[PDB]
Amino acid sequence: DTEERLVEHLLDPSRYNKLIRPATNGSELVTVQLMVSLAQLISVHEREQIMTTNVWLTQEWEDYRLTWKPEEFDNMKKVRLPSKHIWLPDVVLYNNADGMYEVSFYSNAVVSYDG
Amino acid sequence: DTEERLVEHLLDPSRYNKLIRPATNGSELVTVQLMVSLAQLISVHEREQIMTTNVWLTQEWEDYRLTWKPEEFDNMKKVRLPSKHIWLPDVVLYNNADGMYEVSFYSNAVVSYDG
Amino acid sequence: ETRAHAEERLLKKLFSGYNKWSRPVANISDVVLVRFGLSIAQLID
Amino acid sequence: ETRAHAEERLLKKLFSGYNKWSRPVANISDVVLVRFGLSIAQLID
CA angle A91, A96, A97 (to 5 degrees): 150
Pick from B1, B10, B8: nearest CA to B111 = B10
Quote the CA–CA distance of B3 and B107 in Å, as a whole number.
19
AA identity, residue D8: E
What does R_g of chain A's alpha carbons equal in angstroms? 18
Q: Please check whether residue B91 is in contact with residue B57, taking contact to mean a CB–CB distance below 8 angstroms.
A: yes
Method: cryo-EM
Pick from A57, A56, A58, A53: nearest CA to A40 = A53
Resolution in units of Å: 3.7
Quote the CA–CA distance of C41 and A104 in Å, as a whole number.
35
Q: Please check whether residue A50 is in contact with residue A97, taking contact to mean a CB–CB distance below 8 angstroms.
A: yes
Q: Please check whether residue A32 is in contact with residue A59, taking contact to mean a CB–CB distance below 8 angstroms.
A: yes
Q: Please check whether residue B30 is in contact with residue C41, taking contact to mean a CB–CB distance below 8 angstroms.
A: no
Diameter over CA atoms, chain D: 53
DSSP state of D29: S
Taking the alpha carbons of A24, A25, A29, A33 in that order, is the dihedral positive or negative? negative
Q: Please check whether residue A7 is in contact with residue A26, taking contact to mean a CB–CB distance below 8 angstroms.
A: no
Quote the CA–CA distance of B49 and A106 in Å, as a whole number.
28
AA identity, residue A105: F
Quote the CA–CA distance of C36 and C43 in Å, as a whole number.
20
Task: For residue B71, count other CB atoms closer than 10 A to its CB.
Answer: 9
Among C15, C21, C25, C27, which would you mutate to test the B interface (most chain B Cβ atoms within 10 Å of its Cβ)? C21
Q: Chain A: give the shortest CA distance to residue B83, in Å.
A: 18
Pick from B21, B106, A65, A50: nearest CA to D44 = A50
Secondary-structure breakdown of chain C: helix, strand, coil percentages, each rounded to the nearest 5: 25, 0, 75
**3-state SS class at A36:** strand
Q: Which chains touch D (3 or more CB pairs under 8 A)?
A: A
Contacts of A68 (CB under 8 A, 6+ apart): A6, A9, A10, A113
The continuous run of DSSP H or E covering B51 comes out as: strand B50-60
Task: For residue A7, count other CB atoms closer than 10 A to its CB.
Answer: 19
Q: Is D7 touching A (CB cutoff 8 A)?
A: yes
DSSP state of B113: T
Q: Please check whether residue A79 is in contact with residue A3, taking contact to mean a CB–CB distance below 8 angstroms.
A: yes
Q: Please check whether residue A56 is in contact with residue A36, taking contact to mean a CB–CB distance below 8 angstroms.
A: yes
Give the residue from chain A lying closest to B90, CA to CA. A107
Give the residue from chain D lying closest to A98, CA to CA. D44
Quote the CA–CA distance of C6 and C11 in Å, as a whole number.
9
Residues on chain D touching A65 (C-beta within 8 angstroms): 4
